[PDB]
């Protein structure tokens, strides 16, 4: 059985004080979620250490939202794997569409970041997804296959999460049809050498479509943006039925 | 007199443990430094909170190495001004050439980040600098004029530091001649409405050229990369002599 992973991508939200208030409201709500479900909060760099303290010994895992591909060096503004493992966090989001759109991320640098994360013992969540223009031009399959191939060069597929996030579904409320997400995620799984990789859907997941999305046989989890920002919403997604 | 500011840009170096060890060796060496000299360490996001607790009541100020231009939002991996001011830090490096080279920074986004830092009460250090290609083409002056103009739209020039870092001098050991840094920095100062702005030189500053660089009439400080990584080196740069 593949691992179920419900991950919240806070993006650029929440001071440490706001993160603490979230956790005050969130921890009681997921106490009885099935123990086998992995719950991850992927939070700003400046929230990691404080939240690490508040979560130690509990079930909730922390993720960073980026990591650089070198161990150290002349990359002003970047955070290294060693900085993250010192805090003891478990996950890192890599290759998110917003870093490809705005901040120069390529398939090649995404791959290198994944490798750096793995060698440090972090669990990478590699994000892939086609644009509206690519989808409209009929290019989804080719784009996704190429992002997966380039993203996974030399990557250990026993320590890997993939999130399919069609770019047009991110933050728009235009959730991808669950059967179409299943279709593309099935195509991703076909490219893999380890078919047991957890593959998530992301893109306007909310408490009212999580059940339907998780009901798809190829889909093993969700990377949740806006609906992960408040406790009750994210808890209902963690507590998806059945 | 303009404010003298000696800033260390650690770039992607130092875990919290390594940052703590640096401060142990560094604090004794600048205890008696001239009180008029502002000493700044610009450190990775994950070191800011821990170092801040070790620095209360001291003279050493902290800077971050980036900040985003929006207060919050869908910018996975980015840190907002509110996240930094919560920690209480004083400075932020903006528009460093490494962000422009690798991570999609433009003059326009550097400007917007400067505005965000200022509105939060952070002191921005805006980095400008020409490439080797632009330098060899005789385009330094036009390039710098353009970066300063675009970088400073709507910017409060009473809360502003500029670092001139010719790109070919960064991390190479090819330090720009002091009188040439002085010449270009004079041209920068001519473009400002507030002539009292602190303008730093950056690019292979070390303990053996800091005296000559600081003696130039237009140069008010230094943004120091590799030579800020260990305490004895950086202290001698803080303790520059006539
Ligand atoms: Na499923
Ligand atoms: Na001077």
Residue numbers in the entry:
A (entry chain A), B (entry chain B): 1 to 242
Mind quoting what the paper says about this structure?
Triosephosphate isomerase (TPI) interconverts glyceraldehyde-3-phosphate (G3P) and dihydroxyacetone phosphate (DHAP) near diffusion rate-limiting during glycolysis and the Calvin-Benson cycle. Thus, in land plants the ancestral cyanobacterial TPI originally present in chloroplasts was replaced by a duplicated version of the cytosolic TPI. Herein we found that Synechocystis TPI (SyTPI) is highly resistant to oxidative agents, suggesting that TPIs from prokaryotic photosynthetic organisms evolved to cope with ROS at the expense of redox regulation.
In order to have a structural understanding for the insensibility of SyTPI to H2O2 and thiol-conjugating agents, we growth protein crystals of SyTPI in complex with 2-phosphoglycolate (2-PG) that diffracted at a resolution of 1.6 Å. Resolution of the crystallographic data revealed that SyTPI assembles as a homodimer and that each monomer folds into a canonical (β-α)8 or TIM-barrel composed of eight α-helices and eight parallel β-strands. A superimposition of the crystal structure of SyTPI with TPIs crystalized in the absence of ligand (AtcTPI and AtpdTPI) illustrates that SyTPI exhibits a closed loop 6 conformation. In AtcTPI and AtpdTPI this region folds as a short α-helix, whereas this region in SyTPI folds as a loop that connects α-helix 6 and β-strand 7. SyTPI contains three cysteines per monomer. The thiol group of residue SyTPI-C127 is completely buried, whereas the thiol group of SyTPI-C176 contains the only accessible thiol group in this protein. An electrostatic map near residue SyTPI-C176 shows that this residue is surrounded by amino acids that have a negative electrostatic potential (D174, E212, E180) limiting the potential of this residue to react with GSSG or with H2O2.
